[PDB]
Design a binder for this molecule. Structure first.
Ligand SMILES: Oc1ccc(C(=C2CCC[C@H](c3ccc(O)cc3)C2)c2ccc(O)cc2)cc1
Ligand SMILES: Oc1ccc(C(=C2CCC[C@H](c3ccc(O)cc3)C2)c2ccc(O)cc2)cc1
Lengths: 10, 230, 234, 10
């Protein structure tokens, strides 16, 4: 759900 | 975990290699709106670099995704602030947010609660320059902030934190400090981390206040990082 | 300053001698608890602890050498940190519980009785668990508590000289910590590592104080002294 | 301040 979840993925 | 197999120089080179660039601001800011407009815009772009920086901190990727989230949520303003303090070292009485955005405390008066935090940042910056803080030491401290600031809510982070401690000592020995100067300097650096936490806490308190969030439109990312503290 | 002349062992002896006592709360198990009752109990306890803390600070080497305004500032800044590390130290032998007083032992479930308390409780519990796993020593604890007093408000016109004196005493306490660890038989690597571990915990104690303080001056939004300590943080 | 006073009390 968090934007941080996505950005932390290569 | 690859982090532990690293030598001290390797650890240093990895951290130096992970370093984000110094960004430029998107017009001397006075008034609440123009100041926060510029700062939030810069903070948002720095956050994207910070997230990708954290991935390249040895040991960080070995953590679960949720732990990575927790640590970044906890430490992001601390990490922004030590970066700011570092850049501002060569500019006494001033804060170098960007090479094209140099502020003095007089412009902090434009924003409620900014001046007090402005002064704290200035003092921390002055302290770092008095200690002659080195770039290699700086990147160790920033990594420690990431791994430590949310660690007490584990054995892996403990060992990595120990390794960064070994790395800090290694650097100081490399610089020719005696054993006494080494542990004294180690202590001095780590005590400053407490003030960085303090500045982040007092900063965050104003920043996620409903009053402050109304000043200028915020990016969804910056809003989520702010709401993470509650 | 005598503080700069004391040996490591003399510094330890001084800090140990200066230790405040452990106070009792007004807790009565036969009396029903509530948000107000629970907070009144902790506030009452904190208030009496502060008086002893002020006199403890007077016996911390180097503290009395400072101007009265600086002494006030440092205590206004660090008082909740000092209360909290004390609480955490007393609670070491009680996993999953916080020992505010010999007659007041609370677990986190009782923390939910006050708004925002359960969050601070967990952090205090985490800190206590950390001290326990490190096997924190009493000699180490008194050094850490004195560091907090001198360090927490050193940032936040000569008086730069006054700041310098604080930095000198802080170096002294560092030397003392190393001395204890060397005495304990730790290797040099183990000494530096443990020193780092202890000092990093201070960042967590700062966080807990600031978060607690934030909730504390919203609870009111208390004795006069405690009200003034709280007010110092606006 | 009370703190100021208590610090003075010799
Ligand atoms: O949403 C925000 C707003 C401001 C900041 C910010 C600051 C620093 C200066 C003070 C500021 C603040 C704090 C309290 C106030 O009442 C007003 C301003 C926070 C900052 C720090 C480092 C950096 O690289 C970029 C931005 C980060 C994220
Ligand atoms: O007025 C007060 C009330 C409570 C405390 C307090 C604490 C610790 C536990 C949590 C507490 C708290 C935090 C957030 C809340 O919303 C409510 C209570 C504060 C405390 C700490 C150490 C000690 O020896 C005695 C008291 C100190 C002064």
């Amino acid at each position: 759900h968090k934007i941080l979840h996505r950005l932390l993925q290569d | 975990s690859l982090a532990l197999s690293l030598t001290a120089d390797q650890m240093v080179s990895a951290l130096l290699d992970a370093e984000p660039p110094i960004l430029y601001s998107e017009t001397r800011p006075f008034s609440e709106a123009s100041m926060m407009g510029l700062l939030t815009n810069l903070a948002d772009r720095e956050l994207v670099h910070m997230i990708n920086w954290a991935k390249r901190v040895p040991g960080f990727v070995d953590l679960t995704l949720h732990d990575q989230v927790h640590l970044l949520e906890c430490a992001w303003l601390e990490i922004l602030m030590i970066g700011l303090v570092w850049r501002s070292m060569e500019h006494p009485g001033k804060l170098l947010f960007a090479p094209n955005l140099l502020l003095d405390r007089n412009q902090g008066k434009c924003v409620e609660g900014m001046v007090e935090i402005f002064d704290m940042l200035l003092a921390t910056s002055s302290r770092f320059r008095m200690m002659n803080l080195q770039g290699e030491e700086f990147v160790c401290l920033k990594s420690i902030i990431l791994l430590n600031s949310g660690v007490y809510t584990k054995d892996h982070i403990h060992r990595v934190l120990d390794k960064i401690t070994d790395t800090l000592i290694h650097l100081m020995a490399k610089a020719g400090l005696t054993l006494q100067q080494q542990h004294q300097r180690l202590a001095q650096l780590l005590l400053i981390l407490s003030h960085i936490r303090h500045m982040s806490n007092k900063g965050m308190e104003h920043l996620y206040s409903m009053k402050c969030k109304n000043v200028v439109p915020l990016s969804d990312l910056l809003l989520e990082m702010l709401d993470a503290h509650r």
